Amino acid sequence: TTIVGVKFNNGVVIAADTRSTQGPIVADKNCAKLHRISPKIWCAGAGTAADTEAVTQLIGSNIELHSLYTSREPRVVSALQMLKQHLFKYQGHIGAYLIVAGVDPTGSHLFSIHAHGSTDVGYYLSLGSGSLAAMAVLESHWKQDLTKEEAIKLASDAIQAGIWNDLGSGSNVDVCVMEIGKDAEYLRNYLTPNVREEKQKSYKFPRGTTAVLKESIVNICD
Amino acid sequence: SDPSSINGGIVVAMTGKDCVAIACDLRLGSQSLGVSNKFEKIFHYGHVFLGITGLATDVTTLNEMFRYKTNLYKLKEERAIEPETFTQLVSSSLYERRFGPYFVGPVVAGINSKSGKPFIAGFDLIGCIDEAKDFIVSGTASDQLFGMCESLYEPNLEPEDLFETISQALLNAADRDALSGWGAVVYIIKKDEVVKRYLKMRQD
């Protein structure tokens, strides 16, 4: 898994691969690693697939409420404290490694959370078995004051780093952008560089090939 | 010792043109010992199907669990549960036991009565939803199944055809797995109708 986050002049963006695996076997060739916490607070996750979705929804929920109760848009530092204390509560057993970013009345924000519950903040970050590849790229092409379009390429490149040079990551690239005054855009399948070449032959078996013994109908409606 | 590997079993489901299919083998054994050759692993609640491979006691329990949960849903909502939804139910129901899981690998297949687009999904033992628009597999012969499917599959297959495909996938992947086989069943599904056929296979 490869997840990245890069801050830019008036917002933030994050991205991730789409390979989910049970060991050396690809479980989902395009699973979604970006999670909506609140309209303008999104988080990306690597680690145990299920924990990333769970701790993400759980908090997403606890957040949604908190806002209604305060008639205020949510703040990242909140999702962050909420995520971190939960994770730290569970001594590390919730394999969720997350990059959480988004916009709120106080500004733009970017952070990272490790499953043991420690947090970090910076202008660019990455995590996952592809962490190293991308971080490399990130250390190779970043510079302060990046535009929206410059940032995306950056983050896009970095994932591609992961995809190509890490068995644990692959397929497509998911990107989400969050800018200070606009609605947030979820770009699912921004890049699709791994399409299967047409198969060489067709195995449409002539009908009847299979040997059947008994055959019946089933009753659905009551 | 690998709970997921004591009893044995495999299930696979595939999407087609306005249809879905799901199948499984009929074996139930204890390690090397074959025990029952009538352990259907596909259950259905209304028009939503779910198959479960893994530890037999859990397979059973869960099934019973989903009956209960789906029955209450119907009374409370006065309509039969839909796949997209049911799935989320299964997922949440597994994660509830994140630190002492049911050793299984559910797979879901069915169609939205309202929308009509076929649907299938699978999960790991703790909830991760495996959404794929082509095929799902599970069981001791997972590796095998993946193999069979990824090769033989092709989009928009008609009911009479998809049948063959899924059947071969199962049949053949089973034969390469010691712990699975001893019989097989396949469910073909359509908006209004559903058919259940049993297959002829080696009994070794």
């Binding site: 479980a27 996750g45 697939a49 078995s129 644990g168 | 790991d124 703790i126 495996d130």
Partner: peptide, 4 residues
Amino acid sequence: YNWX
């Protein structure tokens, strides 16, 4: 479980 899956990784994702």
